[PDB]
Structure 1
Amino acid sequence: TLSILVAHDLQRVIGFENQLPWHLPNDLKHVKKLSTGHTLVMGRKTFESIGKPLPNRRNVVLTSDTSFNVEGVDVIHSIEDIYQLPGHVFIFGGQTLYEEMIDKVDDMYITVIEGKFRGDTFFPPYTFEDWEVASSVEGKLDEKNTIPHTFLHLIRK
């Protein structure tokens, strides 16, 4: 099982200046719940942004840099390496990885952030022509979590 795991806004912004544009504790809990006990594949910049590997799952960083050898992180050097990892693999970002993988994955877990953020990094356009909504769940709003948001599980048709 290969899946995309992404949050993006109404214009498919995912990133600004190597961080998430929004503060949304609930999306990160969503991420924790989905990926715990499984495998994340991410690009180097995304990892640097996050600093350390997420506890309680396999962290895999795709990078060209032969000197990368960080404790708790496995490194891969080619996309083709992804297909050799066992178990449930989530493509974790960023833009380059989504572009390379979106035609390849079984499904996508997308948080739609119902807002318009200033961004420098984007999720690629897709159609629901190609993707079936297996589920759509409204995020609940509170004072911790103030941006409307929807969790989609999409499966390739």
Structure 2
Amino acid sequence: TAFLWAQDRDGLIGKDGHLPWHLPDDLHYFRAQTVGKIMVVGRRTYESFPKRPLPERTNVVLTHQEDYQAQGAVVVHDVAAVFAYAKQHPDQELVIAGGAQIFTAFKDDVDTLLVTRLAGSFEGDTKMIPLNWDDFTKVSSRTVEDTNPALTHTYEVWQKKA
């Protein structure tokens, strides 16, 4: 299972309840990362999400409710309910998108990690969860210095070890 998200110098991710705005470049990666397959998302996330469900992207809703539903999307309550779907759907891949509440949920199950270290700084009140970098291994990491000094980023790909 993979985890795709972007972190800045400070290591921020997003907001919890501000609704400021989203970047076009930083947004393309957030989705393009696992789009086109079984991408998980928090209930709160699936809501704000540009669309429900996503066009060409299988989404999943994680909530403590045992009756929670979604139009087209899949409804799960934890990392056990998601793996259950992906279990019956060995054709598609399982990659968690968010949110933070969902990140630390699969942190102990994630077999692969994806982080984008952006040189520039980003605002927000929500920080990234405590990842066990010691439990995982870095398989790839290279920074990309674009024209914009703040639009820079590093693509890190980690693989959970035993």
Tell me whether the two structures share a fold, i.e. TM-score over 0.5.
Answer: yes
Structure showing greater relative contact order (alpha-carbon pairs closer than 8 Å, 6 or more residues apart): 1
Alpha-carbon shift at residue 132 of structure 1 (Å): 2.1
Structure 1 ranges of 4+ moved more than 6 A: 19-22
* AA aligned opposite 1:136: S
**Corresponding residue for 1:78?**
78
TM-score, normalization by structure 2: 0.77
- The 10-residue stretch of structure 1 (111-120 or 7-16) with the greater mean CA deviation from structure 2: 111-120
SS of equivalent residue, structure 1 residue 85: helix
Indicate if the aligned counterparts of 1:39 and 1:89 stay in contact, CA closer than 8 A: yes
SS of equivalent residue, structure 1 residue 103: coil
1:154 corresponds to 2:158: yes
Whole-angstrom CA distance in 2 between matches of 1:33 and 1:25? 12
Whole-angstrom CA distance in 2 between matches of 1:74 and 1:135? 31
**Corresponding residue for 1:61?**
61
* AA aligned opposite 1:5: L
Deviation by residue 1:37-71 (Cα, 9 ceiling, x = unmatched): 31111111222221413221211011134564332
The alpha-carbon distance between structure 1 residues 27 and 134, as it changes in their structure 2 partners (threshold 3 A), is farther
Percent pairwise identity: 34
**Structure 1 spans left out of the alignment, 5+ residues:** none
Whole-angstrom CA distance in 1 between matches of 2:24 and 2:6? 12
For residues 37-116 of structure 1, what are the structure 2 equivalents within 5 Å?
Answer: 37-52=36-51, 53-65=53-65, 68-86=68-86, 87-116=92-121
**Corresponding residue for 1:8?**
7
